mmCIF file with all atom_site columns, C-alpha atoms in Angstrom:
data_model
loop_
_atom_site.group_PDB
_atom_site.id
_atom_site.type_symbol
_atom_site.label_atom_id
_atom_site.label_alt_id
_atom_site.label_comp_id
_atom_site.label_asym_id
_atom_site.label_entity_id
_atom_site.label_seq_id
_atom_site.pdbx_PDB_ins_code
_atom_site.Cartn_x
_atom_site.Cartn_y
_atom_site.Cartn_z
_atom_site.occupancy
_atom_site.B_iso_or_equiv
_atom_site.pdbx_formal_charge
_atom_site.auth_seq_id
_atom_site.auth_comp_id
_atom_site.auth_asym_id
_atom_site.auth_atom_id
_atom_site.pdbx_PDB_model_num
ATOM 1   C CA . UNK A 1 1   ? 129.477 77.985 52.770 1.00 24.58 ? 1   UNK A CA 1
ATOM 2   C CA . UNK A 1 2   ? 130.906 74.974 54.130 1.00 24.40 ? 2   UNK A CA 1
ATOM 3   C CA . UNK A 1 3   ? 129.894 71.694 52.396 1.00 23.09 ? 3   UNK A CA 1
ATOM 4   C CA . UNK A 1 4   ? 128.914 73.880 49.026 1.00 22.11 ? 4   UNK A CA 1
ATOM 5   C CA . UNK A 1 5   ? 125.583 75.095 50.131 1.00 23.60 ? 5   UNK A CA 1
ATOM 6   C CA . UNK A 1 6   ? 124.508 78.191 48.403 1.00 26.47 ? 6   UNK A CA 1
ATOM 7   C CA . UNK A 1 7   ? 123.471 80.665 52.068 1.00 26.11 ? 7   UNK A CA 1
ATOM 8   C CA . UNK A 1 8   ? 123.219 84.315 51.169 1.00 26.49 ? 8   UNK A CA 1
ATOM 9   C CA . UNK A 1 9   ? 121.538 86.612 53.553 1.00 27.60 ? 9   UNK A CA 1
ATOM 10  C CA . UNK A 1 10  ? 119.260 87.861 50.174 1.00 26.26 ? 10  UNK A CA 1
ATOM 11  C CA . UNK A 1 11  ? 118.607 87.290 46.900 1.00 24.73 ? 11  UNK A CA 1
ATOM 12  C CA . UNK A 1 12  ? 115.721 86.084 44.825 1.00 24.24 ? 12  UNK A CA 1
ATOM 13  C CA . UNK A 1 13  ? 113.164 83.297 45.826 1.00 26.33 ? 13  UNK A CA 1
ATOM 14  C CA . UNK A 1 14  ? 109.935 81.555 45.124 1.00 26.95 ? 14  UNK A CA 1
ATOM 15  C CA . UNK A 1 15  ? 107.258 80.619 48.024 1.00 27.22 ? 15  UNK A CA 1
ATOM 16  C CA . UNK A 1 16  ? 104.464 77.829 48.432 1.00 27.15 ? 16  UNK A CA 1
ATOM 17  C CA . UNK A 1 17  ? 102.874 77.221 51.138 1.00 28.65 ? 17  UNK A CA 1
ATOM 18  C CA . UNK A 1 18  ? 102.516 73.721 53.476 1.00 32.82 ? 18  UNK A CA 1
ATOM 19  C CA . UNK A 1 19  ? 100.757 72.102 56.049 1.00 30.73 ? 19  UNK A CA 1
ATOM 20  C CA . UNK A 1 20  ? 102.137 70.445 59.537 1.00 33.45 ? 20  UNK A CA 1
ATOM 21  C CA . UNK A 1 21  ? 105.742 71.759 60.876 1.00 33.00 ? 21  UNK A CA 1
ATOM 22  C CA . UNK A 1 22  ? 105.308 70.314 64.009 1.00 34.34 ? 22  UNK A CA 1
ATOM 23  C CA . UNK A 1 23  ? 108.069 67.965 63.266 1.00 29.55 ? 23  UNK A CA 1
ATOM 24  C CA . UNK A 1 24  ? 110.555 69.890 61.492 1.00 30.54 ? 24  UNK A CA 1
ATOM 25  C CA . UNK A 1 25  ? 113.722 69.048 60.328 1.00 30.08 ? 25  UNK A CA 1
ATOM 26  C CA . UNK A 1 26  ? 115.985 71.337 62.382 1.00 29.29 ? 26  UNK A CA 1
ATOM 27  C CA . UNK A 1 27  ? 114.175 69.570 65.536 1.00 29.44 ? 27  UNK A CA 1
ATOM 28  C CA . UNK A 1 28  ? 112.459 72.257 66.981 1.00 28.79 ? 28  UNK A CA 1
ATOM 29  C CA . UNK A 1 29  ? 109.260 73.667 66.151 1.00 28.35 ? 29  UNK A CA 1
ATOM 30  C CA . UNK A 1 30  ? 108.440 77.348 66.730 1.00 27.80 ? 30  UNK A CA 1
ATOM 31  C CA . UNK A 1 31  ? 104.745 79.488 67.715 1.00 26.88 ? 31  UNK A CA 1
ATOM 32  C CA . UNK A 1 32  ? 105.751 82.324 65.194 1.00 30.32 ? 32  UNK A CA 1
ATOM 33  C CA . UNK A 1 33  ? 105.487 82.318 61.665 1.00 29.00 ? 33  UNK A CA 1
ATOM 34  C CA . UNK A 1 34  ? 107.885 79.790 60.042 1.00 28.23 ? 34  UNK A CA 1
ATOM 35  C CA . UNK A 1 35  ? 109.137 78.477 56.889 1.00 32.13 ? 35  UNK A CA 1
ATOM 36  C CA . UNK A 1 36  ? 110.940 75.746 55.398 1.00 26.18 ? 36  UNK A CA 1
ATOM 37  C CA . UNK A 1 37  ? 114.040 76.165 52.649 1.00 23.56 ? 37  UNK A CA 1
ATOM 38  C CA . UNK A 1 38  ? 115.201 74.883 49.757 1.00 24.72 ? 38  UNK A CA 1
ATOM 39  C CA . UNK A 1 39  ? 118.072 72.027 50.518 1.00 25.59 ? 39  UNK A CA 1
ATOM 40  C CA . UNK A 1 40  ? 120.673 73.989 49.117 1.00 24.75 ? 40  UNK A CA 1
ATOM 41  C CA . UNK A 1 41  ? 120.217 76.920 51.304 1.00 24.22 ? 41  UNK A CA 1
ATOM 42  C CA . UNK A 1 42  ? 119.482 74.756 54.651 1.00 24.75 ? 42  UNK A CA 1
ATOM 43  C CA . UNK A 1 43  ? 122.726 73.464 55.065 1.00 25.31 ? 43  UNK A CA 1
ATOM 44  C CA . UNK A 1 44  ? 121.620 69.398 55.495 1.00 29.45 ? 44  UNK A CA 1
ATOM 45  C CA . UNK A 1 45  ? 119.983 66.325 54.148 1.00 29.11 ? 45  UNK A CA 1
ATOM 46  C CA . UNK A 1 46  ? 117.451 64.419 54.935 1.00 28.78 ? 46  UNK A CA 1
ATOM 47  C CA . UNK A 1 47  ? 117.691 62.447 58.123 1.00 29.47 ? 47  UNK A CA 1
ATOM 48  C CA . UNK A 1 48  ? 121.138 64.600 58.743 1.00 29.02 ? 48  UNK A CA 1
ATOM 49  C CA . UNK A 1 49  ? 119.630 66.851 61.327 1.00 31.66 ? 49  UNK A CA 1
ATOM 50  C CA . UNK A 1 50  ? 119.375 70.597 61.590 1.00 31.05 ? 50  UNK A CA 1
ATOM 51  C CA . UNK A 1 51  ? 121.982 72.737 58.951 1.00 29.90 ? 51  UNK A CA 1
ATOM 52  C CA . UNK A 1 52  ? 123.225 76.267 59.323 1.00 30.07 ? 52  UNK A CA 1
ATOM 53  C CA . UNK A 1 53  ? 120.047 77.782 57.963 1.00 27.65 ? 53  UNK A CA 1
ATOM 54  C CA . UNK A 1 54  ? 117.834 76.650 61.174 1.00 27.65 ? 54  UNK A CA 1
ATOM 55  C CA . UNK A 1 55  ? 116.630 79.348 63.038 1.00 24.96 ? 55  UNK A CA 1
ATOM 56  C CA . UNK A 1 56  ? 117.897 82.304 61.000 1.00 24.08 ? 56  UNK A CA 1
ATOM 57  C CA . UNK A 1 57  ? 114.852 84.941 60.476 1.00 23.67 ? 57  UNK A CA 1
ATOM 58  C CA . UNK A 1 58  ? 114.445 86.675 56.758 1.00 26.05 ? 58  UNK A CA 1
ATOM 59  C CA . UNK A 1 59  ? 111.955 88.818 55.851 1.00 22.59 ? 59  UNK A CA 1
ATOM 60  C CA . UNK A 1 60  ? 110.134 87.605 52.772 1.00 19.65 ? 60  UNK A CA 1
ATOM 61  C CA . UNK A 1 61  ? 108.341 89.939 49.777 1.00 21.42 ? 61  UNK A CA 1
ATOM 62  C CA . UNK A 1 62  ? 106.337 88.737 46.930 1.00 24.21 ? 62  UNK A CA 1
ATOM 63  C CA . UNK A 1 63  ? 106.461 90.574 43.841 1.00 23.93 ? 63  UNK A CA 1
ATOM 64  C CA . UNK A 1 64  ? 104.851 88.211 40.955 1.00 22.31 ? 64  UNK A CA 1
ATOM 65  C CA . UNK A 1 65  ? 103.158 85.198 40.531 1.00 22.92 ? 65  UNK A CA 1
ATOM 66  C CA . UNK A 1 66  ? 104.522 83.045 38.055 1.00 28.78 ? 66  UNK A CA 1
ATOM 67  C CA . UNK A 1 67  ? 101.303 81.049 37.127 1.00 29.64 ? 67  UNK A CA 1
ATOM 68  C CA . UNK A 1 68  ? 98.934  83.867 36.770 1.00 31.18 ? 68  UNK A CA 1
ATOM 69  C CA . UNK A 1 69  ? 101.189 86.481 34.420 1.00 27.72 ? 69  UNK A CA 1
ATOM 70  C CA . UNK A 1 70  ? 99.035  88.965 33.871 1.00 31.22 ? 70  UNK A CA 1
ATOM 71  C CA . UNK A 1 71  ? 97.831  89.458 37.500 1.00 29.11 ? 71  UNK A CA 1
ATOM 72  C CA . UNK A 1 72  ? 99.511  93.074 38.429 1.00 31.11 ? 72  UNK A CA 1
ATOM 73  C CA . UNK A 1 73  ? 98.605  93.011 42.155 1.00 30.72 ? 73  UNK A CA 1
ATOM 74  C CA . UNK A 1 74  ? 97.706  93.129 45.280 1.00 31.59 ? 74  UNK A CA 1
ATOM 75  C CA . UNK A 1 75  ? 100.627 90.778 46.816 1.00 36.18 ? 75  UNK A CA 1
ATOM 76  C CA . UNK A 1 76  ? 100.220 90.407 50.899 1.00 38.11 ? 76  UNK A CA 1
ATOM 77  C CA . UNK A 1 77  ? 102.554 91.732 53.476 1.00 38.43 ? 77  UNK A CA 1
ATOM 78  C CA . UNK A 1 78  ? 105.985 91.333 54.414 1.00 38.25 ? 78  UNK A CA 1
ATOM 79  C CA . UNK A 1 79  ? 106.776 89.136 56.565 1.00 40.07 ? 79  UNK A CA 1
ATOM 80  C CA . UNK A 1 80  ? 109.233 87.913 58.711 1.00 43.05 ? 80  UNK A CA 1
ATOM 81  C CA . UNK A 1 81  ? 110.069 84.186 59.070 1.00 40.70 ? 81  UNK A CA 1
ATOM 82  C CA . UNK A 1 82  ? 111.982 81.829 61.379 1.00 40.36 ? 82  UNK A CA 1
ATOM 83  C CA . UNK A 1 83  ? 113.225 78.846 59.130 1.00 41.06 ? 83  UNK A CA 1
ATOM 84  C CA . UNK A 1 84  ? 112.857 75.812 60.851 1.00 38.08 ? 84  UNK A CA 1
ATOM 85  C CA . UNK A 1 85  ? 112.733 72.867 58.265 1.00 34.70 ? 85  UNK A CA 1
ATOM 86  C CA . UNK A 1 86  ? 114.116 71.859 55.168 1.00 33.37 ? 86  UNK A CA 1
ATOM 87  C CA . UNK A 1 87  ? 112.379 71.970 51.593 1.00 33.17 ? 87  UNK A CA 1
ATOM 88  C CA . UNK A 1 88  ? 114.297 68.592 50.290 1.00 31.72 ? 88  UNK A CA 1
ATOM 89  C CA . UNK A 1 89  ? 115.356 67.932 46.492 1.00 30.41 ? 89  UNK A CA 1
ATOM 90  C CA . UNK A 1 90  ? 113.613 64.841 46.881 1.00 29.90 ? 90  UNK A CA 1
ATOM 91  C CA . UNK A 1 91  ? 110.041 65.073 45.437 1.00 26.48 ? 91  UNK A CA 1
ATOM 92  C CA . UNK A 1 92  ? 110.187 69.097 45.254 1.00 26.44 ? 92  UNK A CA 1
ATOM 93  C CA . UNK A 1 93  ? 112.257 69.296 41.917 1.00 26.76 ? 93  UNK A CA 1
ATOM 94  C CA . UNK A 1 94  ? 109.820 72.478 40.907 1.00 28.93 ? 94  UNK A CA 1
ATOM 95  C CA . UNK A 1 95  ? 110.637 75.132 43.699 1.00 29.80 ? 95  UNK A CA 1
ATOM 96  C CA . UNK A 1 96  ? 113.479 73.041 45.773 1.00 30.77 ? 96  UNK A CA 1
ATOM 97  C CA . UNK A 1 97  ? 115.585 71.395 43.428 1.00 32.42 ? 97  UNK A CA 1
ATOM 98  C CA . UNK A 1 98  ? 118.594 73.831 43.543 1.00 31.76 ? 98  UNK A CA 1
ATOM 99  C CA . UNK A 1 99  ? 121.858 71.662 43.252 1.00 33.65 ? 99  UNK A CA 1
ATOM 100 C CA . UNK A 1 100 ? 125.508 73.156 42.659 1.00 34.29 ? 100 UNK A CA 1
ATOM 101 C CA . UNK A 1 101 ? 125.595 72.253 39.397 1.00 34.47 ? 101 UNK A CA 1
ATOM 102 C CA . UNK A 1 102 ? 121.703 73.645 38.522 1.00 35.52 ? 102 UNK A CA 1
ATOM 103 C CA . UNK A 1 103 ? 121.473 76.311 41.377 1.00 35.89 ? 103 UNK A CA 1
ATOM 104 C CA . UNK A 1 104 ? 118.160 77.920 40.318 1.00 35.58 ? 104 UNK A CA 1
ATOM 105 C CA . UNK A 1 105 ? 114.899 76.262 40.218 1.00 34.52 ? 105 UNK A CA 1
ATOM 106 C CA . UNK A 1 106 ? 112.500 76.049 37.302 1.00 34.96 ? 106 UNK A CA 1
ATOM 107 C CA . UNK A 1 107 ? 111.041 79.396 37.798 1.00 36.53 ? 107 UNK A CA 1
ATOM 108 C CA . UNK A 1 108 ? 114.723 80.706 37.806 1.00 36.90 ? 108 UNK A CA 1
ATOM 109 C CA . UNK A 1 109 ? 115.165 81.060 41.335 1.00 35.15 ? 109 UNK A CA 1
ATOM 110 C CA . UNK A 1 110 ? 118.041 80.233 43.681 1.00 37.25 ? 110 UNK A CA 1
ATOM 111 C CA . UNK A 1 111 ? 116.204 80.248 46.959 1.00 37.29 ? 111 UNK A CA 1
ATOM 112 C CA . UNK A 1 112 ? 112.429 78.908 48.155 1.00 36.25 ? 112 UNK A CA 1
ATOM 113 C CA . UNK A 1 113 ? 110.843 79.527 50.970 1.00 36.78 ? 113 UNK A CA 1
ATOM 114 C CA . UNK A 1 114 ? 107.685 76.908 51.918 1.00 36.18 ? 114 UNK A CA 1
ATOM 115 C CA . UNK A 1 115 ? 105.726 79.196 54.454 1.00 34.48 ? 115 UNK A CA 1
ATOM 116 C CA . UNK A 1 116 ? 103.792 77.251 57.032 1.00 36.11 ? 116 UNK A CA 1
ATOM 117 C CA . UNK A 1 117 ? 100.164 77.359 57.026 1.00 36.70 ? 117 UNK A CA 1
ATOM 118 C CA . UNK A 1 118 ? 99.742  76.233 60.083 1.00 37.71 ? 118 UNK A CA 1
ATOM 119 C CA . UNK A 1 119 ? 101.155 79.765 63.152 1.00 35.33 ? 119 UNK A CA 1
ATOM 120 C CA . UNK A 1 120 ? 99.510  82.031 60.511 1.00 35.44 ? 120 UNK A CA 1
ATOM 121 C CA . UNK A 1 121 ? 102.581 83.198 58.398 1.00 37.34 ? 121 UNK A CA 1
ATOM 122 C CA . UNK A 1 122 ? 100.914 82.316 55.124 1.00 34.59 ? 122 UNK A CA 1
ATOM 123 C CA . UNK A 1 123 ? 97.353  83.605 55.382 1.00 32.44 ? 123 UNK A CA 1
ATOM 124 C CA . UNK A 1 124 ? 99.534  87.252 55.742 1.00 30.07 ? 124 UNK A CA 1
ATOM 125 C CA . UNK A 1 125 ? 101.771 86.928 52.752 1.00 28.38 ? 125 UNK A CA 1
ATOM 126 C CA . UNK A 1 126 ? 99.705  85.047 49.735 1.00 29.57 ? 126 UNK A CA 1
ATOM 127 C CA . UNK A 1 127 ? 96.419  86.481 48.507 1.00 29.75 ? 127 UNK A CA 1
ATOM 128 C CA . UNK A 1 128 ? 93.425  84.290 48.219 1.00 28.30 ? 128 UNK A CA 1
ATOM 129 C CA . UNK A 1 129 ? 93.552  82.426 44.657 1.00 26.82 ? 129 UNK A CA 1
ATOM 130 C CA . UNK A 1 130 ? 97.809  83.143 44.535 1.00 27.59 ? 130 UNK A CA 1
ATOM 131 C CA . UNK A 1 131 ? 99.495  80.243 46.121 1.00 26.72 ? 131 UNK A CA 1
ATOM 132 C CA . UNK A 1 132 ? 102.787 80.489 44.167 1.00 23.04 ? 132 UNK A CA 1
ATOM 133 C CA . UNK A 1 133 ? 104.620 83.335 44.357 1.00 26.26 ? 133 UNK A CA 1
ATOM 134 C CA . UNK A 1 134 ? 108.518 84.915 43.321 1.00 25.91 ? 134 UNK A CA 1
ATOM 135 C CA . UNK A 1 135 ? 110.028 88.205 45.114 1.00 27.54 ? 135 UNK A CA 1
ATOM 136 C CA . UNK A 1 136 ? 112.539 88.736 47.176 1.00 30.23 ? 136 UNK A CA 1
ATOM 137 C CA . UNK A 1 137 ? 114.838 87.868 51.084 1.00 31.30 ? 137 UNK A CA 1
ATOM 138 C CA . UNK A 1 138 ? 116.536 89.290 53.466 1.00 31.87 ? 138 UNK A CA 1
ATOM 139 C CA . UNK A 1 139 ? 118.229 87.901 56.722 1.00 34.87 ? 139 UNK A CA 1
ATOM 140 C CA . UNK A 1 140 ? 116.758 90.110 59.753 1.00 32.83 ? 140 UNK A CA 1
ATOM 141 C CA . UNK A 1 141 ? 117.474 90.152 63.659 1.00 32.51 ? 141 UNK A CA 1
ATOM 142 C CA . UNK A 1 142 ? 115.170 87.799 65.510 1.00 33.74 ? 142 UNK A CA 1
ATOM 143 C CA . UNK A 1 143 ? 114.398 91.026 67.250 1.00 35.59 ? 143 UNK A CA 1
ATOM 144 C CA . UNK A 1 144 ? 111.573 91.081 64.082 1.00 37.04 ? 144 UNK A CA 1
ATOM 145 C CA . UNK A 1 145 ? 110.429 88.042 64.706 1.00 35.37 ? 145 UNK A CA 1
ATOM 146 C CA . UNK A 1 146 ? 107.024 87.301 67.045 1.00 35.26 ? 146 UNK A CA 1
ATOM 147 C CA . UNK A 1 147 ? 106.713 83.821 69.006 1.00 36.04 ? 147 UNK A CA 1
ATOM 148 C CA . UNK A 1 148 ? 108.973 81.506 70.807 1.00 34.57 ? 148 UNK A CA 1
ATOM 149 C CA . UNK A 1 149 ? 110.732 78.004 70.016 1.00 30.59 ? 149 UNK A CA 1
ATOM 150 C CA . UNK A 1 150 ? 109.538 74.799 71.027 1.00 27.75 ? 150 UNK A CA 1
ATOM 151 C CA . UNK A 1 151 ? 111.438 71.959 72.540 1.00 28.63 ? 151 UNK A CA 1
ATOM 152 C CA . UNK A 1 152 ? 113.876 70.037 71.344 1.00 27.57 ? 152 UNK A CA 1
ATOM 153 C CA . UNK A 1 153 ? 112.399 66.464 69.324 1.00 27.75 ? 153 UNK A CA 1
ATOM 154 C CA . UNK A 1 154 ? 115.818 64.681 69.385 1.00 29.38 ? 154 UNK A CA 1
ATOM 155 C CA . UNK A 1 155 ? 119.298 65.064 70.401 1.00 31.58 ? 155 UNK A CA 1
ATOM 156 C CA . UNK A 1 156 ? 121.343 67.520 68.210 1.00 27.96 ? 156 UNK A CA 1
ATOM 157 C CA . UNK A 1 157 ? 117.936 69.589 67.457 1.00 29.73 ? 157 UNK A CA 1
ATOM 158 C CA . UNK A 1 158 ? 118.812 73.137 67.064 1.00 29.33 ? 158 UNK A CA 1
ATOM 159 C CA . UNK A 1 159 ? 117.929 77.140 66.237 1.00 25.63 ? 159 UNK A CA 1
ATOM 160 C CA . UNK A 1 160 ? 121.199 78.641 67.402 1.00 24.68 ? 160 UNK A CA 1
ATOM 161 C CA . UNK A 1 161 ? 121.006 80.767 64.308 1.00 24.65 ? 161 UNK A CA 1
ATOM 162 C CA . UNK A 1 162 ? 118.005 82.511 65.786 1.00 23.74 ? 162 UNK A CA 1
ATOM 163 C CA . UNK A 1 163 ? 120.997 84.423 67.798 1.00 23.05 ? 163 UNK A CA 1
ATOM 164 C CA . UNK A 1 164 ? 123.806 84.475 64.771 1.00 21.55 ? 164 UNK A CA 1
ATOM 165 C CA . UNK A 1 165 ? 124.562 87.490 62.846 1.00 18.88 ? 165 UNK A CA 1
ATOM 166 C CA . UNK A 1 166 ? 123.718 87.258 59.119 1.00 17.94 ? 166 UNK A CA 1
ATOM 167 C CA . UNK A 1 167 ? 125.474 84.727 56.533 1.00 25.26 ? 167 UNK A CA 1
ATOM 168 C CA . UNK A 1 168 ? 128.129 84.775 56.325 1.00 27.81 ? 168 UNK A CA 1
ATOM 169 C CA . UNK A 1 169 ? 128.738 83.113 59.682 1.00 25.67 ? 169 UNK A CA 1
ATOM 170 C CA . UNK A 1 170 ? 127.927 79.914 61.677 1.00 27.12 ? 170 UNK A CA 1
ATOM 171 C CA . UNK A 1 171 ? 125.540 78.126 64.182 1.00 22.10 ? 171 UNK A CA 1
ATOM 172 C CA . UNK A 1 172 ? 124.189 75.479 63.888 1.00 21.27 ? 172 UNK A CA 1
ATOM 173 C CA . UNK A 1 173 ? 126.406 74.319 61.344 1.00 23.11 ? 173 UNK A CA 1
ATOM 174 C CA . UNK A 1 174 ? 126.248 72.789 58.319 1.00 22.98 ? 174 UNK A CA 1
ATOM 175 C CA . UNK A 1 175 ? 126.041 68.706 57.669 1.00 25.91 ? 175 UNK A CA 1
ATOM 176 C CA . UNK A 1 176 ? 126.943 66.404 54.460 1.00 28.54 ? 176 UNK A CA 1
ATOM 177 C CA . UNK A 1 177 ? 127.612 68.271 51.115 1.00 31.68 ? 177 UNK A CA 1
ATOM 178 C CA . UNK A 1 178 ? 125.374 69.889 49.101 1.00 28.93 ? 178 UNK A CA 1
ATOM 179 C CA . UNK A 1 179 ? 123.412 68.201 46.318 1.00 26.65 ? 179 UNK A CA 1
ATOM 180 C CA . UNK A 1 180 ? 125.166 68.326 42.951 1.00 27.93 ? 180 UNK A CA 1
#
């Protein structure tokens, strides 16, 4: 997309899990489950405001966990995600240091997804004892997504791509270039 950023509506990713998105970096918090992405894939750096990846809704399935091999199942549920922050490449070189140049992450993947603990979406999707986990994405319709957006923290906060059809295409917009 515009400014190099690597936005597909699926592929491959790994997912952690984190604590207080109250203060996101698309500028709007949400009540449904949410989840932060990799800087490549959200469209902005930090202190840029919100990139083209704020709002959209994927559904999220984990397959494998990388860090306990030889564990063959259960994985939780699918869910279905409204991104509303950004995982930065800054101090999250493990799962979120995609760059144009190095486009996976150490576990091979191009994408992350950091689930919020905090609306729920988390305690459906890892098991107990599994907090690390690879699978798959794909963009959905908001129309599969439960909750509603919270006000705007700042001028030029935004989810416009909560209404967008799937990448490739254009909301809130992208900011900056994309980490090399």
């Amino acid at each position: 997309a515009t400014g190099g950023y690597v936005q597909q509506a699926t592929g491959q990713a790994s997912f952690t899990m984190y604590s207080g998105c109250g203060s996101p970096a698309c500028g709007k918090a949400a009540s449904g489950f949410t989840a932060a992405i990799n800087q490549l894939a959200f469209g902005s750096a930090p202190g840029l405001g919100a990139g083209d990846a704020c709002g959209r809704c994927f559904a999220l399935t984990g397959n494998h966990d990388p860090y306990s091999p030889n564990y063959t199942g259960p994985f939780g549920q699918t869910i279905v995600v409204k991104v509303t922050d950004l995982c930065p490449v800054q101090g999250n070189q493990e799962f979120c240091g995609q760059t144009t140049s190095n486009p996976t992450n150490q576990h091979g993947m191009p994408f992350h997804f950091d689930i919020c603990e905090d609306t729920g979406g988390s305690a459906k999707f890892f098991p107990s004892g599994h907090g690390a986990l690879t699978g798959t994405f794909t963009e959905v319709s908001c129309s599969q997504w439960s909750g509603s957006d919270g006000g705007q923290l700042w001028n030029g906060a935004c989810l416009s791509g909560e209404t967008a059809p799937n990448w490739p295409s254009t909301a809130c917009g992208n900011k900056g270039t994309a980490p090399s």
